[PDB]
Design an enzyme around this catalytic site. Structure first.
Site, mmCIF file in Angstrom:
data_model
loop_
_atom_site.group_PDB
_atom_site.id
_atom_site.type_symbol
_atom_site.label_atom_id
_atom_site.label_comp_id
_atom_site.label_asym_id
_atom_site.label_seq_id
_atom_site.Cartn_x
_atom_site.Cartn_y
_atom_site.Cartn_z
ATOM 1 N N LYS A 187 3.538 6.516 5.367
ATOM 2 C CA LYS A 187 2.478 5.316 4.791
ATOM 3 C C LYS A 187 3.048 3.886 4.957
ATOM 4 O O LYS A 187 4.166 3.690 4.824
ATOM 5 C CB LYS A 187 2.156 5.558 3.528
ATOM 6 C CG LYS A 187 1.201 4.660 2.585
ATOM 7 C CD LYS A 187 -0.347 4.895 3.447
ATOM 8 C CE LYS A 187 -1.173 3.770 2.815
ATOM 9 N NZ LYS A 187 -1.283 2.611 3.839
ATOM 10 N N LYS A 191 -0.116 3.316 -2.983
ATOM 11 C CA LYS A 191 -1.230 4.228 -2.976
ATOM 12 C C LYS A 191 -0.844 5.726 -2.962
ATOM 13 O O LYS A 191 -1.558 6.644 -3.344
ATOM 14 C CB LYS A 191 -2.025 3.981 -1.588
ATOM 15 C CG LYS A 191 -2.892 2.663 -1.704
ATOM 16 C CD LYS A 191 -3.661 2.436 -0.475
ATOM 17 C CE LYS A 191 -4.519 1.115 -0.536
ATOM 18 N NZ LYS A 191 -3.768 -0.262 -0.886
ATOM 19 N N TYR A 222 -10.454 1.898 5.906
ATOM 20 C CA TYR A 222 -9.409 1.776 5.250
ATOM 21 C C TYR A 222 -9.625 0.770 4.126
ATOM 22 O O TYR A 222 -9.970 -0.157 4.402
ATOM 23 C CB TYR A 222 -8.024 1.784 5.947
ATOM 24 C CG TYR A 222 -6.816 1.276 5.012
ATOM 25 C CD1 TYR A 222 -6.028 2.293 4.444
ATOM 26 C CD2 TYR A 222 -6.039 -0.052 5.244
ATOM 27 C CE1 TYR A 222 -5.067 2.337 3.789
ATOM 28 C CE2 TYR A 222 -5.195 0.046 4.524
ATOM 29 C CZ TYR A 222 -4.317 0.966 3.715
ATOM 30 O OH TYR A 222 -3.147 0.648 3.014
ATOM 31 N N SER A 282 1.943 -3.402 3.042
ATOM 32 C CA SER A 282 2.133 -4.564 3.243
ATOM 33 C C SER A 282 1.467 -5.434 2.075
ATOM 34 O O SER A 282 0.661 -5.086 1.447
ATOM 35 C CB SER A 282 1.241 -5.113 4.448
ATOM 36 O OG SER A 282 1.889 -4.370 5.608
ATOM 37 N N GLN A 306 -10.401 -5.161 1.662
ATOM 38 C CA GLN A 306 -9.934 -5.924 0.359
ATOM 39 C C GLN A 306 -11.335 -6.116 -0.548
ATOM 40 O O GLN A 306 -12.268 -6.390 0.058
ATOM 41 C CB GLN A 306 -9.449 -7.309 0.496
ATOM 42 C CG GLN A 306 -8.061 -7.216 1.229
ATOM 43 C CD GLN A 306 -7.287 -8.427 1.641
ATOM 44 O OE1 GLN A 306 -6.551 -8.853 1.090
ATOM 45 N NE2 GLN A 306 -7.762 -9.065 2.706
ATOM 46 N N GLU A 313 -0.551 9.844 5.078
ATOM 47 C CA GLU A 313 -1.236 10.105 6.449
ATOM 48 C C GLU A 313 -0.213 11.008 7.348
ATOM 49 O O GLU A 313 0.885 10.671 7.286
ATOM 50 C CB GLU A 313 -1.628 8.633 6.989
ATOM 51 C CG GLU A 313 -2.588 7.963 6.289
ATOM 52 C CD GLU A 313 -3.057 6.641 6.584
ATOM 53 O OE1 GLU A 313 -2.486 6.339 7.990
ATOM 54 O OE2 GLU A 313 -3.394 5.727 5.919
ATOM 55 N N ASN A 324 -8.809 -0.865 0.278
ATOM 56 C CA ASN A 324 -8.045 -1.119 -1.471
ATOM 57 C C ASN A 324 -9.237 -0.763 -2.313
ATOM 58 O O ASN A 324 -8.830 0.039 -3.203
ATOM 59 C CB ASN A 324 -7.134 -2.339 -1.501
ATOM 60 C CG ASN A 324 -6.477 -2.349 -2.514
ATOM 61 O OD1 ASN A 324 -5.416 -1.543 -2.542
ATOM 62 N ND2 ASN A 324 -6.744 -3.315 -3.670
ATOM 63 N N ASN A 333 6.223 -9.800 6.102
ATOM 64 C CA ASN A 333 4.922 -8.708 6.623
ATOM 65 C C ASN A 333 5.269 -8.819 8.030
ATOM 66 O O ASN A 333 4.694 -9.739 8.717
ATOM 67 C CB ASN A 333 3.667 -9.050 6.192
ATOM 68 C CG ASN A 333 2.591 -8.186 6.463
ATOM 69 O OD1 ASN A 333 2.732 -7.637 7.457
ATOM 70 N ND2 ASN A 333 1.602 -8.320 5.808
ATOM 71 N N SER A 376 0.870 -1.200 0.001
ATOM 72 C CA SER A 376 0.098 0.047 0.035
ATOM 73 C C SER A 376 0.631 1.321 0.113
ATOM 74 O O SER A 376 0.115 2.355 -0.087
ATOM 75 C CB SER A 376 -0.896 0.121 1.187
ATOM 76 O OG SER A 376 -1.783 -0.958 0.960
#
Ligand code: PBC
Ligand code: CL
Length: 363
Positions: A316, A67, A151, A319, A120, A273, A153, A344, A64
């Site tokens: 940001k 993003k 949050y 993962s 997701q 963020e 995707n 991760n 991410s």
């Protein structure tokens, strides 16, 4: 003297080494931008099986963190007058006319406030144009657009897809052929060339299962970038100094430095963020916590967008099943950090490494 380079290596080693051990991270790359100079620290193995060491050119999945690249492309569309943040989503894709996306703004999508789009895509939606189209056409908000952050995707993925539509070209092509070259990024990929594959780290999961990300719906928009620590630091340096780029791209980057609402200590921009800086480690961990990522939170809307600059930290996490990335920078101190790993491991631990480094560069 050798004192400053020695001090920096000691600082970074002390931050990284225990976290790698505690989280069994095979390989990790750090890149730091300090006083207009880059510094690289590489640890461990990009692939355990063949013994290949991490370097500043090793490619990692950034998940991410992608993003923020998506947000930059949108910033280009916005500041080229191809779209506006208050446009309804269905203004940019005729398939969405008549759906609930008639009443959802591009800003809502970008900032996860469309009304409960999930973390997701459900597993019933494969990487297939028709399936993705049908998913959005049928989706209905759980709560009013503009009111709660969840949050997501599919939310910011749709934002990126629509930004690409507004520019008249596929998302992946625009990123490859326009965004990455404009940012000076030659080691940054959505689809890793065969010639670069030797640099692609292995990802590791449970029982050290090997994990490189497979195809998924809006993967490019949401989580598709593979890059090196050195290239990702170039992207941080572009963010620290947008004025150094050609003006259309400066404006695109600036569009990602505007905050729209707060949740807790965090101010939400496009991709990035932000936090006030300094702030405690515990608070920075809490802003990047599992509840922040997984639960809906009522937003506190700002009366006007706020410049994400000065005494602030922009960050940001990213993962994938095999990788864990974190990026942070402090505009008003010309300080930037990238931490890329091939496991991760928890966001709290990523933030622990970063905080130790950033605090030790302050002192
Ligand atoms: B990102 O790494 O936070 C992410 C979120 C949802 C789906 C894929 C990636
Ligand atoms: Cl997804």
């Amino acid at each position: 003297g050798e004192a400053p380079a020695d001090r920096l290596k000691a600082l970074v080693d002390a931050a990284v080494q225990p976290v790698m051990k505690a989280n069994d991270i095979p390989g990790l790359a750090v890149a730091i931008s300090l006083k207009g100079e880059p510094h690289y620290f590489s640890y461990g193995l990009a692939s355990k099986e063949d013994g290949r060491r991490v370097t500043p050119e090793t490619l990692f999945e950034i998940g991410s963190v992608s993003k923020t690249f998506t947000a930059t492309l949108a910033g280009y569309a916005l500041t080229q007058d191809k779209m506006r943040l208050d446009d309804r989503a269905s203004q940019h894709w005729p398939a969405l006319q008549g759906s609930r996306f008639d009443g959802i703004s591009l800003l809502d999508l970008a900032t996860y406030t469309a009304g409960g789009l999930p973390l997701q895509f459900p597993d019933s939606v494969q990487k297939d144009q028709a399936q993705i189209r049908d998913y959005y056409r049928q989706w209905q908000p759980t709560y009013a657009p503009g009111s709660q952050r969840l949050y997501s995707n599919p939310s910011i993925g749709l934002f990126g897809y629509l930004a690409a539509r507004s520019l008249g070209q596929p998302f992946e092509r625009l990123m490859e052929q326009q965004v990455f070259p404009a940012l000076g990024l030659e080691q940054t990929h959505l689809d890793v060339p065969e010639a670069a594959l030797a640099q692609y780290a292995q990802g590791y999961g449970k029982d050290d299962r090997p994990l490189r990300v497979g195809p998924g719906p809006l993967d490019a928009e949401g989580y598709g970038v593979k890059t090196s620590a050195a290239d990702l630091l170039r992207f941080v340096d572009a963010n620290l100094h947008p004025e150094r780029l050609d003006r259309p791209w400066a404006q695109a980057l600036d569009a990602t430095h505007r905050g729209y609402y707060k949740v807790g200590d965090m101010t939400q921009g496009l991709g990035w963020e932000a936090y006030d800086w300094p702030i405690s480690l515990k608070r920075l961990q809490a802003g990047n916590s599992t509840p922040m990522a997984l639960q809906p939170h009522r937003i506190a809307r700002l009366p006007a967008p706020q410049a994400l600059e000065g005494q602030r930290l922009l960050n940001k996490t990213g993962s994938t099943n095999g990788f864990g990335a974190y990026v942070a920078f402090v505009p008003g101190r010309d300080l930037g950090l990238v931490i890329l790993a091939n496991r991760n491991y928890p966001n709290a631990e990523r933030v622990k490494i970063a905080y130790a480094i950033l605090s030790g560069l302050e002192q």
